[PDB]
Amino acid sequence: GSSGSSGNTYVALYKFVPQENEDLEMRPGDIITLLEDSNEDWWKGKIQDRIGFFPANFVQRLSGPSSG
């Protein structure tokens, strides 16, 4: 990301099954790059070799390594 602004990463909790191209496929344990967060119910991101829309209730914003 050239001169990125919002570097928010999300880790897919469960596997998603896209019915149409528009939808994006993800697996439990992958890293998705949140690109568009205008919506609230569903968010858009970018995967290694995959791309598209996906539900937020499936992923969990990655805050970071919790520690004292």
Swiss-Prot record:
Whole-protein residues included: 288 to 342 of 402
Cell compartment(s), UniProt: Cytoplasm, Cytosol; Cell membrane; Cell membrane, Sarcolemma
Organism: Homo sapiens (Human)
Transmembrane segments: none
Complex formation: Interacts (via SH3 domains) with CACNA1S. Interacts with CACNA1H. Interacts with CACNA1C.
Domain of life of the native organism: Eukaryota
Role of this protein: Promotes expression of the ion channel CACNA1H at the cell membrane, and thereby contributes to the regulation of channel activity. Plays a minor and redundant role in promoting the expression of calcium channel CACNA1S at the cell membrane, and thereby contributes to increased channel activity. Slows down the inactivation rate of the calcium channel CACNA1C.
Descriptive protein name: SH3 and cysteine-rich domain-containing protein
Ranges for domain SH3: 8-62
